[PDB]
């Protein structure tokens, strides 16, 4: 009966990255931990993590400390250590392919995600929670945009997203969707307009 889940949000550690668009996954993970009362003191495998459960389901919430593109250096070994099956590895990260605040849940672009993919022996069949941050504007390249803080209007949407994502994580893991994740994806898109 031991099948923990690994909830990892991606980002770059440090005051330098605090509040930036690219760190949204870190925000979400700080949110889930908080809500669940899980402290992330533990430092292992290039990451800070905490342990607890969602309902009866045991989980580990993590924030890799190796920097975005090398997230796999943490996740891969971390999963092995705790014996987390691929299907229970939930990655949360910023997605430019979706408008601001639209979440997307999938179970099978972004550098952190390729590296993680790389370390999970290329396997791809794990669930992922994308948090949209929109498209960057084609000047200072699509690079300072990510390293920039969210405008106030964007924050609105973002804060709403953090709240709904927390719920989405709890449903996937414990509750059950009670529709397909694709229906949740549809509702996200619609909500962007309301």
Swiss-Prot record:
Active site: 22 (proton acceptor)
GO MF terms, alphabetically ordered: peptidyl-tRNA hydrolase activity; tRNA binding
Chloroplast keyword on record: yes
Residues at the site labelled Stabilizes the basic form of H active site to accept a proton: 94
Main function: Required for the splicing of group IIB introns in chloroplasts. Forms complexes with either CAF1 or CAF2 which, in turn, interact with RNA and confer intron specificity of the splicing particles. Has no peptidyl-tRNA hydrolase activity.
Compartments it resides in: Plastid, Chloroplast stroma
Organism superkingdom: Eukaryota
Subunit and interaction comment: Interacts with CAF1 and CAF2. Part of large ribonucleo-protein complexes that include group IIB introns and either CAF1 or CAF2.
Boundaries of the shown chain within the full protein: 58 to 250 of 256
Cellular component GO terms, alphabetical: chloroplast stroma; ribonucleoprotein complex
GO biological process: mRNA processing; RNA splicing
Keyword Lipid biosynthesis: no
Organism: Zea mays
Lineage of source species: Eukaryota, Viridiplantae, Streptophyta, Embryophyta, Tracheophyta
Entry's family note: Belongs to the PTH family. CRS2 subfamily.
Protein's recorded name: Chloroplastic group IIB intron splicing facilitator CRS2, chloroplastic
Binding site for tRNA: 17, 67, 69, 111
Protein keywords: Chloroplast, mRNA processing, mRNA splicing, Plastid, Ribonucleoprotein, RNA-binding, Transit peptide, tRNA-binding
């Amino acid at each position: 009966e031991y099948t923990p889940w690994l909830i990892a949000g991606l980002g770059n550690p440090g005051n330098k990255y605090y509040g930036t668009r690219h760190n949204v996954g870190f925000e979400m993970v700080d949110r889930i931990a908080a809500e669940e009362g899980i402290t992330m003191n533990t430092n292992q495998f290039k990451s800070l993590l905490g342990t607890g459960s969602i309902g009866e389901v045991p989980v580990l919430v993590v924030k890799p400390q190796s920097y975005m593109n090398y997230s796999g250096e943490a996740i891969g070994p971390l999963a092995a250590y705790y014996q987390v099956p691929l299907r229970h590895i939930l990655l949360i990260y910023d997605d430019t392919s979706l408008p601001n605040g639209v979440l997307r849940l999938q179970k099978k672009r972004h550098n952190g995600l390729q590296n993680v993919i790389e370390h999970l022996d290329g396997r791809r069949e794990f669930p992922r929670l994308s948090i949209g941050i929109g498209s960057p504007p084609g000047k200072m390249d699509p690079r300072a945009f990510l390293l920039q803080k969210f405008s106030s209007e964007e924050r609105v949407q973002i804060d709403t997203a953090l709240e709904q994502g927390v719920d989405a994580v709890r449903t996937l893991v414990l509750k059950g969707f009670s529709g397909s994740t694709e229906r949740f994806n549809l509702v996200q898109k619609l909500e962007h307009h309301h």
